[PDB]
Structure formats: structure tokens, C-alpha cells
Amino acid sequence: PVPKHIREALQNVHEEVALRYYGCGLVIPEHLENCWILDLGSGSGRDCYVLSQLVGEKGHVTGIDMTKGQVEVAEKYLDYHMEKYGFQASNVTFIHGYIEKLGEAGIKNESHDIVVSNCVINLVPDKQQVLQEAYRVLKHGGELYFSDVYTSLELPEEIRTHKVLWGECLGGALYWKELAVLAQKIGFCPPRLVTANLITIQNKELERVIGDCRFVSATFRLFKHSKTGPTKRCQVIYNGGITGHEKELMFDANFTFKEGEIVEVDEETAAILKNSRFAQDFLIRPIDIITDPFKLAEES
Amino acid sequence: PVPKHIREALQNVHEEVALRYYGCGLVIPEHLENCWILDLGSGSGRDCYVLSQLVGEKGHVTGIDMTKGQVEVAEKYLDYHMEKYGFQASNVTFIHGYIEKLGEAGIKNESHDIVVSNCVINLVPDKQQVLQEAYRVLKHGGELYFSDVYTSLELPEEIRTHKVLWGECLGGALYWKELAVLAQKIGFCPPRLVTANLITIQNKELERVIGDCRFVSATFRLFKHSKTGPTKRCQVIYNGGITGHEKELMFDANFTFKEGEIVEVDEETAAILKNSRFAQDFLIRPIDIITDPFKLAEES
Amino acid sequence: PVPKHIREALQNVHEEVALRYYGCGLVIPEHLENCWILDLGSGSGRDCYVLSQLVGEKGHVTGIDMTKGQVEVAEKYLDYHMEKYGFQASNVTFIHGYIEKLGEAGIKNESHDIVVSNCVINLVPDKQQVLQEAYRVLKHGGELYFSDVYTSLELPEEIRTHKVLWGECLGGALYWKELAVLAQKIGFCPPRLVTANLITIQNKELERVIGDCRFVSATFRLFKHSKTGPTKRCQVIYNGGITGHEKELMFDANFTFKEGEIVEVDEETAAILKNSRFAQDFLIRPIDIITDPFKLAEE
Amino acid sequence: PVPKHIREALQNVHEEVALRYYGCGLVIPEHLENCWILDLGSGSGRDCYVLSQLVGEKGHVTGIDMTKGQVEVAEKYLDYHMEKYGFQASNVTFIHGYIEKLGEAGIKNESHDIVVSNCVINLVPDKQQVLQEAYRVLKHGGELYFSDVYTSLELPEEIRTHKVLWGECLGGALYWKELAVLAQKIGFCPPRLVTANLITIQNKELERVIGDCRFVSATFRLFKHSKTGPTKRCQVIYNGGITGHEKELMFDANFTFKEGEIVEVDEETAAILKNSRFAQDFLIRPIDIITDPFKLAEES
């Protein structure tokens, strides 16, 4: 259920901007205030104008789109939305750039707390290069938070190069076990699976070509942090004050943290909570795991 | 049949320049006025001096040649042709540079509406790198428009490295199915096959080495554009005012658009016509496909 | 046995700094005075503040850490340690940078006599790129001097990508024969094996996954130098005045050089001693080899 | 037989410089006057001080060495040799740099007529990268002129990585058929084999490891030029005035050009003679080939 403050931030984008929106919906994590957020694939501007309010004036939203005309349209509405939001200065910059070349875009290393994306981004050929660029621009303790399509089996290249597959936007889908490998080699913590929904294939020829392989739309959090010291298992208590998730914080599909409850967490979950922006939101004292997005999706 | 205005632009290059022309003939698309056109392999200057007239003074022609002496000769004749054409300032720039390194040449991203080439360019070892540079320098809705040699079968490397093959300028030829793969991975729309002529092999040793493989000279349009929104199937009417193609526009080997006729077109053809410079030339309302250049050439 | 001057340099780092130390211990070569030393993975600052004293004010220590907060903490204590050491100006610089990109860090080519590392560095995926950057920043005759984990057999990628393996910090371990290959292709002399200790595997799933493969922690010196001329076999005499190794210099596991003794050495060892900073420490006149770290550790 | 002017240029290097020479001997092409010559692996300076005289003051010698101390020694003697040679200013520059990174060395594209090397250069792991840098810094019509070790058979990787092989400086040797492949892909004309001498192996273990494979030391000219137009087969007459090769010019092992004789040459040889600096030395009118260095060496 879309928390109210997000619903209302949506209602407050200029209707022209919202009219021009191509996408799958906001894929957006929790606790956004004061953050620097990079929006991969900013399009005509809607998500960034949502985030502008959600991070407030101490925060910043950078949007990057490969289409100069989109960037021009988005920038048309900067002053409108900065006025409507009562902001003395703009907290949103739009860049024309290619997402696998964030450096050429001008985005510095460790400059953003969070990276989110429009689902058009799942239609690169090269996912690894995107993850490397996201990792480079992410601050310590920041997260890549994003939805994409994965496959149940490792498809042969000849099937991934197939015109039918690319016709259904299932081009570039990773075998799901591949995501963790990429994170391991790039420097991310293991992917936190949050949610997963099976994709039904209406296409008859595609039904033939893929075989027993299935497809899933799934959301993962990828955290960037460093091991400054030994970590023990820890207990955490959610203090209950993240906007729109006061009562409980569904962090991933293994951990829902209900306000005030004492939860024991593994070394990595604890490192993530300690090193991220969530640390302000938990009391952390020292002293059945789903990963497979198809089992997750099957169990609804 | 060479449209008159092209014939006459040819007649108007300084006879010295035209004398020094090594090539296969003008491979040149329609509707050139006001465009920025990059000529890969400008040689001594003829094609660029043709294009200078065809785009007019609001337009620009950049030529790039790997041979400094060619560039010097071409530039010798800038003022001659700018006078003859009645242009206030020059609309052509000549660059000494290698075509797989257009960045080092100084050509910016999204700076040219069209990229064409001299057939010497089909004699790179690395076609993909050339296509990546053409994609990068091309504006949104622009086209790479070019002729090259393709093969009917995937030749082994031991045959593509053969000195006989390279002796007939058939070195670097792609297996024709490869072109679409490269476009898919680089960011181009699917190649529009325009025309195709089988190459006869007079060489007896080559007859031996290639076997049942055949070779074709074929022209493709590769468009660069982005998916800002859903596209439906559309109808288009050609308004009939492209210089030299008033009565009808042969866009590719699947679509000839006769003036005033209502043609239903697929989602991609419509995206190309909507996003390119051809949009000015069509009324577009929302409402048997040859790809194989050897089938195309056989049917003449 | 830790030479006294190192022990005392350790005792003289601010207790806060030393408190924050994650690592395997100082892996540090001999004859450090006046040198420029790069510390890969400087952490919160301890090793660099040790080296600051060991190289003295004519020398320099650069530390590089991928974690900006570590760099900030380390730099908090620059003035404390420069005062305590009686140094007119600082001889340590701390950089926030990633070790496989020393160029972007700002470290010039041939700017450092020695490169050492924290064992967290053995947890890169890409060892070769690290070695290329160490070769580039190293002066002629300088050394990469470092400890890491190697394997007795070439593990498949199936197994190196395994979450158990990476869980024990044995991710990224090279098959030991690979080290010399990398040095050959990068420009290093052959690795000098110094010491080696077998790693015991307490993990029961890992016991199953690796099979008959074993793991070793081993220290190698990799020297960078160029062949300006023919080299003969040579004799060398250690003059006996390297701080903390007066009596004898254990150079590697094939050569311990006792003060005053005349030792015949091969062309390669002689080139290294001639072209390095050890040349000041030997008289060099022109006239059974262990390489395998598992044989070394077994003995 | 070493032409006198080379012998005398050697005698005129400061004996200190000549004392410090590690190498295989001058590998140096003909007609050097006024040229820009890059010396890969300049060492302590001897070859460059030879070339300084051979090109004269209108020419230039750049030497590049990976060892800063060598560069310092070489530069110690600049003024000595510039005085002795009666030159108004220095015509040699010494650079500390790595030969596979001539760009970082500061050597511009198309800046040198000729590239020669010290045989230590044959001890890179990466020959192709060296050839790419030599192609890039070479002017149109210039030549890479160099001696190296090649093998009669394609050795497996495990044997090329062998510490015995690398112990005899036979590390990095190419299979001889590989040289032409690299030239084809880089942009060089086919290698001109000039001379070849078999290497005898007096190592017992190496005798075991390589098997039936043999090794040869061989000299090739690699020319860089572009195809500005059709080339016919041609006749050439050597005008007989190249210093030290007045009576005849042994160009390669297929062509010795005796003064005044009329020789018919193939399209490629003619392009090379037309586009190089040798053109001044021939009258060129438009009107049994050894390649295998082991057959060449066997026939002495």
C-alpha cells in the first residue's frame, strides 16, 4: 500500500510532467530525507519531482536520461516545482548522459546515498557496467535499489539474441544466480531480495523458444560498504520513525522489523544496518533465508 | 536513376577534386537540407563538396580522412567551392582522423543528423567499433546510411584472415545476420535493408577457398532513437516534397511510400518516421518482410 | 622475533589509532630509512604511523584506503604523531582511493621505493590489476613486499565463486604457480618466497567443497628492475648494518646472509641486490632452491 | 658489410657511451637523411648518437627507454655530441617512457618517418601493442624496421610461459605466420622479410621442451601507407644515390635494385616505393617470392 506521503508527492507533480510518464511505477526505498538520490533514466521528470519533495531541500535529486529532449522538458518545470514546494533553491539537477557512463555525465565518486532506476534501464545490453557505475557513485553505506527481470535458467546466448525475446523487453534479463556473482565481484554486499512477481508469457513463439525457463520481476537492494573491523551477530530494535513505515519496516523478504521488537540479525544484515542511513532508525547492540526470487514469487 | 539535383551538384565540384576520386559512387540518403552530415572517409573532397550544396548553408558537412595529404588537398578547394556555391561562410570542415576514433577527431556526441561513408571504410578490421562511434556522434532520430559487403555463410577466421580474401577487398565482410546483432547491442533499430547486388567472384583461388559462400553488396539504414513512450501501429501519408523524390519515397525494400497514399506501418517503422527528419514529410496518424540481402539481390 | 625498533615504533602510536586496527600484523621488509613507502589499505592509520618513524623525516609514507572515514580518522592524528616524533613537517600523506586505481589516487610512476599492504587487500577480486599498479608506482630496484593466500591446486571458477570460500576470506586466492606467471608478464623479477604457513580449515562445508586442495599464507618479495647490461654470477658480503638485522639478513628462504660471510649468488639475486637499496649493505664482487610455498610450510 | 659512413658514425660516439652498450648491433634501414627516427629502447644512448649524425641537423632522433637512469646518462652527453657533430642545436631528445605507451611518452601521431629498436624490445610480453604504437607514431609512408625472434611452429601457451624459454630470451617469440596477421589487422602492408639467421639451441632442457620447433632471428620492414587510388604494376629504376648503397639497394630478400636497371614490381612493392621516402631514389613508371624466414635462413 503506497504510503500517503508518496501518494501526495505524486499528486503534486505538474500534470504535464505526469502525463508524459513511461514506466513501471515508483521503485523507491525507505528513509529518503536529506539524501542524495541518483535517478537512472529520469525521462521527462516525474520520479525526480516526486523525490525532490521526499528528500527535501537538504537533499538532492540528480536525474540522468539518454534523450536530450526529455532532459529539456524536465528542466522546463524546475522552477514550477521548486516554487510549489516552497524551496529557496533547486534540489534537482537533470543531466543528459548515458547510464553506463556516469563518469562522463559528471557524477563524482561516492556522491550519492541512493541509486534508483526507471525500468527502461533493464533494457541495456550490459548490466555489469551499470552496476559498476552505480557502485562508484554510491557513498559508503548507500544502496542501489532497483527492479528488473531475471530468468529461472541460464538461457543460451542464441536465445538471448533472439528478436522475439528482445521484442517482449525480456532482452538483457540475467539468470538470477548471476546477480549475486556480479555483486561479489563488483564490491556489493549480497543482494537483498525484497519482492518478486512471476511474469506470464502471452507470446506463443516465445513460449516455444524459451522452453521450461520462466521470468520474474524482482526488486533487490545492493549495499556498498567496507569491513573496517570484526562484526558480531547483533540485535536491533526499530525505533519506529521512518516516514510511512512507523509501525514496522519491511527491510527485505527475510526481515520485517516491527517497532520496538528485539530481532537478532546476522553479521552482514547488522553491518548493513550499522553502516547505512538506517542506523539512525535502529538501536543496535552486539550479541529459512529466501534468496531465490522464483520461490519468493511462487509463495504469494 | 540519379535525381537531377544530385547530378548537378556532382557537375559543380572543381574538376581537379573530382579527378582524384577513388570510390564506389555516392551512397547518400534522402532529405538532406539543413542537416549535419558526417562523411567517413572524405578522401580528397568530392562527396563533401556534393553534400555542401545538398544540405545548403544552414547545414554542415564534416569529412574525416585518415590521410593528412588528402585532407590538405580537400581544404585547398574550400574557398573555391564556397564562392561557386554563393555561401557566406564555409559549411564543410575536414578533419584528419581515424574513423574508429571519432572522439579523438573532435566530433561531439549527438552532433550529426546523418553518417555516410566511402566504401574504403568497409576495409576496417573492426566494424563494431565504427558502428559504436557512428551511434555516439548521431543525434536522436539520425541515421547511419551505408553500403558494405556481407557473406551468405559465417566464414571461419582462417578464411577471413586469408590473403586472397583480403586481396579482393572482401576482407572484413560480415555474415549478414551479424549486422542486426551489432545494432541490437549498440543501440540501433533493426537495419533497414534498402538494396543488394550479388558480387561475382572472378578469382579462381578464391572460388576454391570460400566454397559455397557468396558475397553481396548491400545498403542499410541504421536509425538511432529512444523509446519515450508506447508506440502503436500507425498510418502514414507521404506529403510528396522531398527533393528528387516528390512522387514517391522508396524508404527501404519493404516500404515505398507513394505521394498521398495511406500506408499502414508497424510500430518500429512508425517510430523511425516519427523521430527522424522524415516526420516533416509525412502525415502520421495512429490507427513478406525481406531482411536477407541475398534473397533481395536474387529477385532482381 | 620482532626487532626492538619495530616494537618501539608500535608502542609509540596513539592508543586510539592502535585500538582501531583490523589486520594480520605488520608485513614489513628490512632497511626502511629514507624510503618512500606506499601502504595499500592504510585503514585508520597504525601501520603508517609505525612506518613514519621507521623511514624517518627524509622518507615518506603514503597510505591509501578505500574508506573515506578511515582516512579522516588517520588524518586526525597527523599532528599528534609528527609532534611525538619530533618531525619538522609531516612525512605521511593519507589518500582516499581504491588500490586498483592508484593513478586516480594521484600516485605518480616510479614515486615509491616500497609497496606493502594490509591483508584486507588480499580480498580484491583482481590481483593482477593491483600488481600492475604496484609495478607502475615502484621505482627501479623497489619491491612489492606482501603476504597473501595461495592454493595448492587450481580451483575451478565454480569453487572460487562459492559463498563458503568467500565466507572464509579465501576468496581471490591464487594458485601459487600463478604468482610467478603474473610477475613474468607484468615486469617483476621472479617472486622471492620468504615465509609460508599452512592454513587449517575448520569449516566442515569448505572441507567438502575444496577437496584435496590446501591453502597457505605466504610472503613474497617482488622486485622491479631493468637489464642495463650483462650480469655474471657474483659474490656478496653483508656489511652487517641494517637496523635490527646486524648479525644476519634473512633475505628469502634460499638466502640468509650472515655478516661478513662470502656468499656466491646467481645472476638474478645479484641483480636484485645490486639494483635495490640493499646494495649499500653488501660488498658485491663479480666472480635446493625452494619456490613452492607448501613445501616451505611443511618443513 | 657495414657501409663506411655508419662505421664512422659509430667511431664518433663518446667512448663512455659506447662502453655502456647492451645490444645485438645496429638494426638500421637505408636513406636516413632529414628523417625523424624513433629508437625504441634507447639505452644509454649509443644508437641515437649514431643516428644523430646519420639524419643530420634537419632530422631528429627520439630515444625512449624504460630506465630513468639510462635516460639520465644518455642526456649527460647531448652537448658533447652536438658539439663534436658541429650542430647548432640538438637533434636528439631522450624520453623516459615504456614502449607500449608511446602516447604517455608524449610522442604525437604521424610524427616519425622511421621506428627502429634495441633487441631488448623483443622481450615484451605484448608485441601487438608495440606494433600498434609504432603504427600510430609513424608518418604515412614510414617504416617500422626491426629484428626479432620467430618460431617455426605455434608453441602452446604452457611452453611460452616456461621459465627455461624465458631464460634464453626466447620468451615472447611469435610464430612467424603471426607477424603478417598482426600487420593485416593493425594497418601495416605485408612484412618485407629482409634477412634471417637460424638460432642454435645449446640448452639441453630447452632442446627437450620445444621439440621439433626451431627459432630464427629475422629482420622485417613494416610500411604504413593508405590506398588513395588504384595502383598498377610498375617499373622502377634505382637512381643510385642512397648513402652507402650507390651501386645497388637490397630492399628485401625478393628485390635487389641495381643502379640503372629496369625492374618490374608488383602493385604493393610499387605503392611502398611511391609512398615512402625511397621515391626520391627511384624513377617509377607504370607499365619465387620468399616470405618464410626459415626457408630464407636455410638457403645461406
UniProtKB/Swiss-Prot annotation, chains A, B, D:
EC number: 2.1.1.137
Organism annotation: Homo sapiens (Human)
Any one of the GO BP annotations: toxin metabolic process
Effect of M250T: Frequency in African-Americans 0.108 and Caucasian-Americans 0.100; enzyme activity is 350% of wild-type
Protein name: Arsenite methyltransferase
Superkingdom as given in the UniProt entry: Eukaryota
Family: Belongs to the methyltransferase superfamily. Arsenite methyltransferase family.
Main location group: cytoplasm
Gene transcribed to yield this protein: AS3MT
Function recorded in the entry: Catalyzes the transfer of a methyl group from AdoMet to trivalent arsenicals producing methylated and dimethylated arsenicals. It methylates arsenite to form methylarsonate, Me-AsO(3)H(2), which is reduced by methylarsonate reductase to methylarsonite, Me-As(OH)2. Methylarsonite is also a substrate and it is converted into the much less toxic compound dimethylarsinate (cacodylate), Me(2)As(O)-OH.
